[PDB]
């Protein structure tokens, strides 16, 4: 039994069967709690859930086929199972908080893609849309360990440590030393010799983060608002080390909308990037062009984080959920629509020992195990 809670925007029923359009307090999803989930993932007005059995369920807005259910217009108000993947045990589903395509990774290392195919982000040597998933053929001989998706590009890394990127090339988000759109997954040659263990991808004029088993954080791509973390605002298409995070023992990285977040093994959260609408959690909406510790969580051991477009959610070791950022749609979960300029404790989840959070564009998930 894994209790699941949802809140935020619900205009396209992306919360999965709740009434109203601004769910401003976390709310028990009867539909998702029943699925017994191991992961939830939030895309643009979309929700995805991976069950313990390996099944994938989606719901929300169906435009651009972003849900993989074979339709590509309308809304799916109750979570429905992605039938194309029933023969495969899905480990993880990757989707950006403002994304219109996703990928799903199976336990046997296979990778599928579906949704908006623009800029070749699906990986199929083409810019076709896929209304249902489709096996990324160019990765078949590679045991894939993790996957990530921005809004215009996608990544995947292998168990041997090599990182692949594909998709929109512009502003160097792929990391290949030019700005050429890649329609196939291509190896980031610069990061060879490092064992890459995570990767995160941004939306719009996108950044990309990478993490090696030595705790080294690489960033590249577009650099507006200093989301590359190395000051100023100059992009680049070659991975560069974010020197500040070195030795800090960073273990999770994520990319919201024009900002970057890292969490350390010691429970510290670092954010930087675009400041507007308090998405960084520093009490002010200025841009932060070199990674800063979120002071509002000093001494609270954050064990999990999730970023949406304009909000973040952090989980303490003791099952508490903090939030910060924008609240036009209740996604802060403080019962109002008032912005959370600093990390604020989330209402109505007392006694629920939350272990994982996930976010979408304007929606939030907390769940247990």
């Amino acid at each position: 039994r894994t209790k699941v809670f949802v809140w935020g925007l619900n205009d396209k029923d992306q919360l999965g069967g709740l009434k109203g359009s601004k769910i401003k307090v976390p709310s028990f999803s009867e539909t998702l709690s029943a699925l017994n989930v191991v992961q939830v993932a939030g895309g643009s007005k979309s929700l995805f859930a991976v069950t313990v059995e390996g099944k994938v369920y989606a719901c929300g807005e169906a435009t651009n086929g972003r849900l993989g259910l074979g339709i590509s217009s309308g809304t799916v108000p109750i979570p429905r199972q992605i039938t194309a993947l029933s023969s495969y045990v899905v480990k993880k589903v990757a989707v950006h908080s403002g994304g219109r395509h996703a990928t799903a990774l199976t336990v046997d290392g296979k990778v599928f893609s579906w949704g908006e195919g623009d800029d070749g982000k699906l990986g199929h040597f083409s810019r076709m849309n896929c209304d249902k998933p489709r096996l990324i053929e160019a990765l078949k001989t590679k045991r894939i360990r993790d996957i990530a998706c921005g809004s215009s590009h996608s990544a995947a890394l292998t168990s041997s440590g090599e990182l692949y990127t594909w998709g929109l090339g512009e502003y160097g988000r792929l990391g290949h030393g030019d700005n050429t759109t890649q329609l196939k997954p291509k190896m980031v040659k610069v990061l060879l010799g490092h064992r890459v263990i995570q990767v995160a991808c941004g939306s719009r004029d996108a950044q990309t983060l990478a993490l090696t088993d030595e705790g080294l954080v690489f960033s590249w791509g577009d650099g507006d608002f200093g989301k590359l973390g190395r000051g100023g605002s100059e992009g680049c298409n070659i991975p560069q080390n974010i020197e500040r995070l070195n030795g800090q023992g960073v273990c999770q990285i994520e990319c919201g909308a024009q900002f970057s977040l890292a969490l350390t093994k010691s429970g510290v959260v670092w954010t930087w990037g675009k400041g507007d609408y308090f998405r960084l959690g520093h009490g002010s909406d200025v841009h932060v062009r070199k990674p800063q510790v979120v002071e509002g969580l000093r001494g609270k051991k954050i064990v999990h984080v999730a970023v949406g477009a304009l909000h973040c959610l952090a989980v303490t070791d003791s099952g508490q959920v903090y939030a910060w950022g924008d609240n036009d749609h209740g996604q802060q979960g403080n019962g109002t629509t008032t912005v959370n300029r600093k990390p604020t404790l989330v209402q109505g989840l007392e006694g629920q020992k939350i272990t994982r959070v996930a976010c979408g564009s304007s929606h939030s998930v907390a769940w247990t195990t």
Binding site: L9, K22, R204, A257, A309, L310, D326, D328, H329
Partner: peptide, 9 residues
């Protein structure tokens, strides 16, 4: 204004 911001119906 801010393009990365969702809207309601």
């Amino acid at each position: 204004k801010d393009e990365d911001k969702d809207e309601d119906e």
